[PDB]
Structure 1
Amino acid sequence: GKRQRMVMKLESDKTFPIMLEGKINGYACVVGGKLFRPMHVEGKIDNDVLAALKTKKASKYDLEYADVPQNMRADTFKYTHEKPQGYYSWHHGAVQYENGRFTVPKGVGAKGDSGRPILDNQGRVVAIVLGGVNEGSRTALSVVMWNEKGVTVKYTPENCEQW
């Protein structure tokens, strides 16, 4: 359609895939001046600038996270605490937000789908996908996100799969 193309224009600049030996295992996000990388994804970030940086780990929230260099700080994503119900954007089409649960119509979402930033109707990141489970005819996701206080909140449904 139309929504995915501006998301591709954003992801071509700041979302960086990881390099497993032949394929892509996950996607490093650069948001607010702090590089994010999921743990179960293992490989090398494509940039030689973002590869050399040693990451601190947070095992409760399943994310390595280091600080981005000073030149890269203006060319980062933006983050939003406030999310109303409705429709948000994603690389694979659209994502529904209902009762605090990012859900996706099924058939999409598999291995190599990790760290993709869920955007909004303005271009700001509201969540980061780490995996999900097939809730019948529509799959839900297991994302980390942010709230009004400045506290990273992870939601995870029952028996999710580390994508």
Structure 2
Amino acid sequence: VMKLESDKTFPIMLEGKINGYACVVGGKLFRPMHVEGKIDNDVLAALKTKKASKYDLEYADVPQNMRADTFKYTHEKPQGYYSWHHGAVQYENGRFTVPKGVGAKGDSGRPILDNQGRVVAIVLGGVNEGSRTALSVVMWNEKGVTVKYTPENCEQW
């Protein structure tokens, strides 16, 4: 039994450029609503999406054959660190932050993960606040309720 985890995030192409990302979490597929482009994946690109303006997210149910190859998600956000494509992600007092100079237009849609490989949030954008850059994200509390958090003067990515 060879367990090779496959990509669960996919670049959204626009004018031949990576304008953001989509990902599959909990049998669903998500993409930031403010981000335009075509998912670099035929199968997923064809799926019709329901829109949730409140969360700047569009989503669709992933095909049956993919139901088992998606990110698991959790509400557990103890203060400490997590990871995302660019590296270390800090979580403290309800805000996710990354190092100054990391993160810019194009990262919208990237997931944030705990050490157990579980998704704790999806990035929508950010803003530099001194030595750190605070992120705008979609998260989830214990009840499964989706919550969107956006920092002061945030910039959509």
Q: TM-score category by the smaller chain?
A: over 0.9
Quote the residue 2:38 is aligned against.
44
How far has the Cα of 1:22 moved from its partner? Answer: 2.0
Quote the residue 2:72 is aligned against.
78
Secondary structure at the aligned position of 1:12 is classed as coil
Compared with structure 1, are the counterparts of its residues 137 and 83 closer, same or farther at alpha carbon in structure 2 (3 Å cutoff)? same
Equivalent positions of 1:23-42 (< 5 A) are 23-42=17-36
How far has the Cα of 1:105 moved from its partner? Answer: 1.0
Q: Which runs of 5 or more structure 2 residues have no equivalent in the other structure?
A: none
More helix by share: 1
Deviation per CA, 1:56-87: give whole Å up to 9, x if none: 11111100111111100000000011111101
C-alpha RMSD of the superposition = 2.7
Deviation per CA, 1:6-29: give whole Å up to 9, x if none: x99999611100111221001101
Give me the identity figure in percent: 100
Q: How many equivalent pairs are there?
A: 157
Separation (CA, whole Å) in 1 of partners of 2:42 and 2:115: 32
> What's the TM-score, normalizing by structure 2?
0.95
Structure 1: which 4+ aligned runs deviate by more than 6 Å? Answer: 7-11
How far has the Cα of 1:48 moved from its partner? Answer: 1.0
Separation (CA, whole Å) in 2 of partners of 1:87 and 1:28: 23
Secondary structure at the aligned position of 1:51 is classed as helix
